RNA sequence: AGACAGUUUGACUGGGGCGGUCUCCUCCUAAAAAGUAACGGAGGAGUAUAAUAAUUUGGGGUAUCUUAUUUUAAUUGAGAUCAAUAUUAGAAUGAAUAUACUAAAUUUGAUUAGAGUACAAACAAGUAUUCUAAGGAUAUAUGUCUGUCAUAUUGACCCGAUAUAAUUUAGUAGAAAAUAUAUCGAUCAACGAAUAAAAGGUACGCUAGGGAUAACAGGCUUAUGGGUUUUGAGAGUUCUUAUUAAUAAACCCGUUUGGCACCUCGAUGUCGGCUCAUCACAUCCUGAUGGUGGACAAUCUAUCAAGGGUCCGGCUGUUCGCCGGUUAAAG
RNA sequence: AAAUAUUAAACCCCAGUAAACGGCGGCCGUAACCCUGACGGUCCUAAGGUAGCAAAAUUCCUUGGCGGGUAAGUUCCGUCCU
RNA sequence: GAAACCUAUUUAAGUAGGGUGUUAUUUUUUAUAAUAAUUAGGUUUAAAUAACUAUAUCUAUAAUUAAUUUGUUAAUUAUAAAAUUAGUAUAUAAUAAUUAGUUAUUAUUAGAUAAUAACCAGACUAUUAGCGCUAAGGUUUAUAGUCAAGAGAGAAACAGCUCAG
């Protein structure tokens, strides 16, 4: 398989987020960060990369 | 690019006549056993429409 | 079948339960010819039996000809698979034991250029008696 | 009667080798057959170039402003300096026309020759037509002591001198000077 | 601690079992609408990717061949040629050439919400996208963009979980907890998934059903098998047909090995031997005759012919078969 | 409410047990002839079927080969050993 | 007055929904058949040939080899343009009839909705294909018809063929 997920969180403390993929075996230096829409604010803001959980049992 | 425009050599009465000769041959290669059973009723109607 | 990779690939072709075709015969290269007169599965041994007897006609010692006598265009087309003896039906298709040529009705088996009219009529009659097929011989003379 | 042409494997590999090599580079080092340069150049002297060329690429119109007073004078200066030059430049355009006519007259007449010499002139060796070597007569040499003193600055002469050591380092025309 | 117990121990299938398969994609089959099965033929999928995506801009049109060039080509110039090739992320088909390939500048539309039609379609599921609103990119925009040329690139519901645009009543107020918007976890691959949780033997065997389903036998078929007929490689002193016969070919028979699974599954059957028989002729002897490389004899071959006849014994469970001995012959 | 520290039998590791079960090799070349292989190497194994018997109630090819008995014996006796 | 078809199923002799049947209701045709016009298609056609497998010829121009009959004689090669032929399940630029969709006309008489049952083992023949000895009353699909659920007359006698309902 060789893929991993991660969620993109807002600079604001809304907790809204999107998803994305990257391969596990790469050696990326640059974490992602993008300008996207937080409907809670009705405005674009800078999103940044973060960790995603998993399912336990 | 061998392609060159098509030609209707054969006149129309050939292709009619060619389709007819194509039957007279295949009718000769038949089995006689199939041929009389076909030709036993297939005649009678003609004598019975006439 | 598939002509791409003949030897490499394993080949299968549908038996054609009723296949009939007629192709209007006409001479192109030469004067006289032999032509088939019935749809048929033309084997190879139907040719190799009377292969020498054509060489004795078309080719002779100490005689040189520039142009060409015979034009052949025969190639194999049908694998003709089969099952073993004690095998039930189903469980796949049979395996090979031969190859053949499926020919149409009016097929130029041979095309000749200035070859003895008197021998080919003596040949094709014996040809057709071994094979029990209807075959014909044609020359530009009679036409 | 002509049919389509099939592909050569040469065009195949070039299409593929690039994609292997867009990431990598062929210029980086002795991967390419590369001799080292004239040893007058040094690791520190390239950094002297890089560190200051890094500065020049980072310049823009927004790192800089200019006073209008400096600007308005810059018109009349470079306008009239150019006006003298348009007079100069447009002469060369007129000059080169008449020069090329002279070439056209003779090329008509070169046909009007005997068989022997007409071969050579058409079939000259390119080595003779390919002479781009310098001479004692070069207007950078002939006028060097004059031109060294006519400028307003030594720097603008240093623009020339440092320029040559590069070109001398390229063609390897400098050695242990 | 099978010491003891309660239970499971898939299905399809040309009998069943062993083996193989079980979902999804593309063509042939498929018979010019769509659809169309089979343990029919073949190949593939369980991904990739933050640039391989979005808007603008530039470049040679690509490809095949020849040739010349300050020996150089971002992708040089010229000429001819190409039932659209080159390619278009991977299988196959289909299509595009404003494709595709390549260089570059700005950038995240691979954003949020709500209404609705059409195709397809048992159901559920799946598909394409216009219209309305907010908030952005591109930059003449006048306009274009709601992931990739397309089709596969996966999984229901329950339970549970992290972040949260919203609400709350087990007396009241809070905690707890439930639900809601966004979202994550399965080769549950027997892929509509019966459970979180599952293998075998029965020659000690039982019951209910079935000729819906097998072994002997009948019936259909006759590749195979046996025999007739035509042709005649090659032997026969010469010489195709005294004798012999490869190969190729046209029909017959229903005695072998088998294919199918129509009758019988609601008391029976298997080979062999004793006794008892009957029929065919494609005849082993006897009887008639032609031919002969037939001197006589003995013999070989073919035709007509079913009147009567056609062995005992040793070994073996044995038909058969080898052996001993015989006979007009031991069909 | 959660976590760390303390620890029993049992399980793992280790040891023992073969009139318990169970298991018991191959390759290369070598001697006045190929073949034969005492021997010598070669690789591996926990160890390499030792004694003895052997077409057996154990043998697929098999009515195995030779001999005995019988006018003649797929069974029987004796005997050899993939 | 049917069905033995599709789709799912620890399901295959079971069951469920669609489809077909009956009844009832309604100022009720979204219908069936026949004729004609009309649209796309890419089986078939084909002295067609783009592809694959194989293949027969022609030629400007530019050259070769041997020999003392080297101011001759003789034998030969390559090539732009031109250019043939056969075959195929998974080959077609192009291109039939019929079927199918829509519209109109005529004629029949149903359609829609609701309440609800049975069926979901099929057989043969004609045409057509796939496995099979293009063998089988064989086996699996498609388009009609008949048995099924249907007597009478003809096929010597005959569930499936003809006439007929
Ligand atoms: Mg138990
Ligand atoms: Mg237990
Ligand atoms: Mg119970
Ligand atoms: Mg079963
Ligand atoms: Mg079976
Ligand atoms: Mg169709
Ligand atoms: Mg067809
Ligand atoms: Mg079906
Ligand atoms: Mg697979
Ligand atoms: Mg692309
Ligand atoms: Mg462009
Ligand atoms: Mg060009
Ligand atoms: Mg793709
Ligand atoms: Mg492709
Ligand atoms: Mg999204
Ligand atoms: Mg519809
Ligand atoms: Mg739905
Ligand atoms: Mg999709
Ligand atoms: Mg898009
Ligand atoms: Mg559940
Ligand atoms: Mg209470
Ligand atoms: Mg309360
Ligand atoms: Mg489950
Ligand atoms: Mg299931
Ligand atoms: Mg299922
Ligand atoms: Mg489904
Ligand atoms: Mg017992
Ligand atoms: Mg019973
Ligand atoms: Mg039987
Ligand atoms: Mg028969
Ligand atoms: Mg036979
Ligand atoms: Mg002889
Ligand atoms: Mg002979
Ligand atoms: Mg039955
Ligand atoms: Mg019976
Ligand atoms: Mg019973
Ligand atoms: Mg009874
Ligand atoms: Mg007789
Ligand atoms: Mg008798
Ligand atoms: Mg008498
Ligand atoms: Mg005795
Ligand atoms: Mg006895
Ligand atoms: Mg005897
Ligand atoms: Mg022991
Ligand atoms: Mg021993
Ligand atoms: Mg013995
Ligand atoms: Mg003995
Ligand atoms: Mg003994
Ligand atoms: Mg009625
Ligand atoms: Mg039906
Ligand atoms: Mg199930
Ligand atoms: Mg049942
Ligand atoms: Mg229903
Ligand atoms: Mg209904
Ligand atoms: Mg087409
Ligand atoms: Mg043609
Ligand atoms: Mg040419
Ligand atoms: Mg043809
Ligand atoms: Mg076709
Ligand atoms: Mg059923
Ligand atoms: Mg059924
Ligand atoms: Mg059926
Ligand atoms: Mg059936
Ligand atoms: Mg049949
Ligand atoms: Mg049947
Ligand atoms: Mg059946
Ligand atoms: Mg009746
Ligand atoms: Mg009757
Ligand atoms: Mg009728």
């Amino acid at each position: 398989k060789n893929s991993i997920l991660f969620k993109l969180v807002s600079s604001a403390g809304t907790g809204f987020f999107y998803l994305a993929k990257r391969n596990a075996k790469a050696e990326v230096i640059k974490k992602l960060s993008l300008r996207k829409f937080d409907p809670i604010i009705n405005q674009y803001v800078v999103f940044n990369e973060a960790k995603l959980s998993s399912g336990k049992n | 690019g061998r392609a060159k425009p098509k030609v209707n050599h054969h006149t129309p009465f050939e292709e009619k006549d060619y389709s007819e000769l194509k039957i007279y041959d295949d009718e000769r290669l038949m089995d006689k056993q199939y041929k009389r059973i076909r030709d036993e009723y297939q005649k009678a109607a003609v004598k019975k429409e006439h | 079948m598939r002509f791409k990779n003949l030897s490499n690939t394993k080949q299968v072709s549908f038996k054609l339960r009723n296949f009939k075709k007629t192709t209007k015969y006409r001479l192109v290269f030469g004067n006289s010819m032999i032509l088939l007169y019935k749809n048929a599965r033309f084997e190879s041994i139907y040719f190799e039996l009377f292969r020498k007897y054509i060489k004795v006609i078309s080719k002779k010692k100490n005689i040189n000809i520039n142009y060409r006598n015979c034009w052949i265009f025969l190639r194999m087309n049908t694998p003709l698979t089969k099952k073993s003896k004690n095998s039930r039906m189903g469980k796949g298709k049979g395996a090979l034991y031969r190859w053949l040529v499926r020919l149409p009705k009016h097929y130029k088996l041979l095309e000749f250029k200035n070859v003895n009219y008197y021998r080919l009529n003596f040949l094709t009659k014996k040809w057709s008696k071994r094979l029990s097929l209807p075959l014909a011989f044609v020359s530009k003379a009679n036409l | 009667w002509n049919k389509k042409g099939k592909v050569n494997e040469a065009t195949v590999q070039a299409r593929k080798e690039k994609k292997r090599l867009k990431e990598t580079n062929q210029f980086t080092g002795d991967y390419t057959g590369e001799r080292p340069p004239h040893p007058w150049l040094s690791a520190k002297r390239l950094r002297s170039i890089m560190t200051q060329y890094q500065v020049f690429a980072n310049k823009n119109r927004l790192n800089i402003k200019v006073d209008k007073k400096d600007a308005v004078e810059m018109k009349k200066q470079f306008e009239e300096i150019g006006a003298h030059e348009y007079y100069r430049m447009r002469t060369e355009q007129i000059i080169n026309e008449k020069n090329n006519q002279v070439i056209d007259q003779i090329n008509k007449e070169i046909e009007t020759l005997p068989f022997n010499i007409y071969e050579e002139i058409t079939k000259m060796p390119k080595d003779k037509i390919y002479n781009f070597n310098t001479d004692s007569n070069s207007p950078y040499i002939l006028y060097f002591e004059q031109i060294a003193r006519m400028f307003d600055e030594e720097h603008l002469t240093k623009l020339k001198v440092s320029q040559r050591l590069q070109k001398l380092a390229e063609d390897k025309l400098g050695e242990n000077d």
Side-chain angles (χ1 to χ4, degrees):
Chain A
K1 185 175 180 179
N2 292 319
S3 68
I4 295 168
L5 294 175
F6 59 93
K7 65 184 179 182
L8 277 66
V9 176
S10 175
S11 67
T14 61
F16 186 80
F17 63 91
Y18 288 101
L19 297 172
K21 288 188 264 71
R22 63 180 290 281
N23 191 357
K25 298 188 288 184
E27 298 180 354
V28 173
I29 302 299
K30 300 291 183 181
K31 60 178 73 173
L32 295 182
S33 63
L34 293 172
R35 182 177 174 85
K36 286 184 182 290
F37 188 72
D38 187 74
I40 297 165
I41 298 164
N42 193 359
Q43 184 179 0
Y44 286 5
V45 301
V46 174
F47 289 182
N48 289 317
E49 179 171 359
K51 184 69 175 178
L52 198 152
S53 67
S54 66
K56 276 75 71 174
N57 292 317
Chain B
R2 184 181 290 173
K4 292 186 262 73
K6 295 171 74 173
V7 177
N8 286 320
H9 298 284
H10 299 284
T11 64
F13 288 97
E14 289 185 355
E15 293 180 354
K16 293 182 181 180
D17 287 330
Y18 180 73
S19 65
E20 184 177 0
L21 189 283
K22 192 183 286 184
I23 295 166
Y24 184 77
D25 188 359
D26 292 331
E27 186 175 1
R28 185 173 296 281
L29 295 171
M30 305 298 286
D31 296 329
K32 190 183 285 186
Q33 190 176 4
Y34 177 74
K35 196 187 291 186
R36 64 185 290 272
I37 297 165
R38 184 177 64 82
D39 290 330
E40 191 171 0
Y41 177 71
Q42 187 68 41
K43 299 289 185 182
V46 179
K47 293 187 286 185
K48 197 173 181 186
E49 290 180 353
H50 181 73
Chain C
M1 65 187 290
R2 291 181 182 177
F3 294 105
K4 294 180 183 179
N5 287 316
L6 292 171
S7 65
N8 291 317
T9 58
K10 183 178 184 291
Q11 285 188 353
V12 173
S13 75
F14 294 132
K15 298 178 178 69
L16 296 169
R17 293 292 191 282
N18 52 359
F19 185 74
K20 295 183 262 71
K21 190 181 284 186
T22 62
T23 67
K24 293 185 285 187
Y25 67 99
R26 181 182 62 181
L27 52 84
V28 178
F29 294 99
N31 292 319
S32 65
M33 62 182 178
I34 291 167
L35 61 84
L36 187 63
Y37 188 75
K38 184 179 177 180
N39 289 315
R41 289 174 171 175
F42 185 73
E43 302 176 353
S44 64
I45 298 298
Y46 293 173
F47 182 80
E48 291 180 353
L49 288 168
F50 293 168
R51 183 178 61 79
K52 291 181 183 178
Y53 301 123
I54 293 164
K55 288 185 181 179
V56 172
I57 293 163
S58 66
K59 291 182 180 180
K60 293 184 181 179
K61 290 186 286 185
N62 298 318
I63 296 166
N64 290 318
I65 296 166
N66 292 319
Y67 64 94
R68 187 175 174 86
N69 295 114
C70 301
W71 291 271
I72 289 163
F73 297 103
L74 274 72
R75 295 289 175 182
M76 288 182 180
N77 295 322
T78 57
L80 185 64
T81 54
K82 185 175 179 185
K83 286 184 180 289
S84 67
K85 187 182 284 186
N86 297 321
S87 64
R88 294 182 177 92
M89 295 295 169
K91 296 187 286 185
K93 191 172 190 290
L96 294 174
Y97 66 113
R98 287 176 70 195
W99 289 82
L100 298 171
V101 184
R102 186 178 293 109
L103 293 172
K105 181 67 173 292
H106 295 94
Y107 184 79
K108 293 189 285 291
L109 295 172
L110 296 174
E111 184 71 30
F112 283 150
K113 185 72 171 68
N114 291 321
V115 176
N116 194 352
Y117 182 85
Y118 291 103
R119 301 292 292 164
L120 298 173
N121 284 316
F122 184 79
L123 183 65
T124 192
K125 291 178 174 66
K126 300 291 182 69
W127 181 272
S128 67
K129 190 180 284 186
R130 302 290 184 87
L131 276 67
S132 69
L133 291 172
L135 278 84
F137 179 66
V138 174
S139 64
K140 192 183 285 184
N142 293 318
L143 300 176
Chain D
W1 187 75
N2 287 322
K3 286 184 175 176
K4 290 182 182 179
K6 294 180 182 180
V7 177
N8 286 322
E9 294 179 353
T11 60
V12 175
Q13 291 181 356
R15 188 180 70 196
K16 295 179 181 178
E17 289 179 354
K18 288 179 182 177
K19 293 178 182 177
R20 292 180 181 176
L21 300 171
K22 290 180 184 178
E23 294 179 354
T24 63
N25 190 1
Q26 300 179 359
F27 299 167
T28 58
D30 289 330
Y31 181 82
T32 302
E34 293 177 353
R35 291 177 181 175
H38 189 267
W40 182 74
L41 298 170
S42 66
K44 292 181 180 180
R45 286 176 179 171
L46 298 172
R47 293 182 183 178
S48 69
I49 299 162
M50 290 287 284
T51 55
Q52 196 172 6
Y53 180 71
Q54 181 178 359
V55 171
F56 177 70
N58 292 317
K59 291 181 180 180
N60 300 117
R61 71 185 187 277
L62 298 172
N63 293 318
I64 293 165
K65 292 182 182 179
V66 176
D67 292 331
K68 293 183 181 181
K69 294 181 181 181
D70 294 331
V72 175
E73 292 180 353
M74 191 176 287
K75 288 184 182 180
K76 295 179 183 179
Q77 294 174 358
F78 290 103
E79 286 177 354
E80 292 180 353
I81 290 165
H84 294 86
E85 290 173 354
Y86 180 74
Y87 181 79
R88 189 268 301 160
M89 184 175 286
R90 179 62 175 174
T91 56
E92 296 182 355
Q93 296 179 358
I94 295 164
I95 290 160
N96 292 119
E97 287 175 352
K98 294 183 181 181
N99 290 116
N100 290 317
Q101 291 181 357
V102 169
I103 295 165
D104 293 331
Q105 290 181 354
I106 294 167
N107 286 318
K108 292 179 182 180
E109 293 179 353
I110 294 167
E111 291 179 353
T112 63
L113 264 71
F115 183 75
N116 291 320
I117 298 166
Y118 184 82
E119 288 181 353
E120 293 182 355
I121 291 167
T122 59
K123 294 183 181 179
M124 292 300 291
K126 291 181 181 180
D127 293 331
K128 294 182 180 179
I129 293 166
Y130 184 76
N131 289 116
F132 292 100
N133 293 320
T134 60
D135 291 329
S136 66
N137 292 320
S138 67
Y140 293 103
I141 294 168
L142 293 176
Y143 296 90
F144 180 70
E145 288 181 357
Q146 295 180 0
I147 197 166
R149 297 182 182 186
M150 292 295 288
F151 295 116
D152 304 337
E153 295 182 357
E154 292 179 353
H155 298 285
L156 297 166
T157 59
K158 291 180 182 180
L159 293 177
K160 297 182 180 179
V161 187
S162 64
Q163 181 174 0
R164 292 178 186 180
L165 290 168
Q166 294 176 355
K167 294 179 180 178
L168 291 172
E170 290 179 352
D171 295 330
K172 289 180 176 179
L173 296 172
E175 184 176 1
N176 295 314
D177 296 331

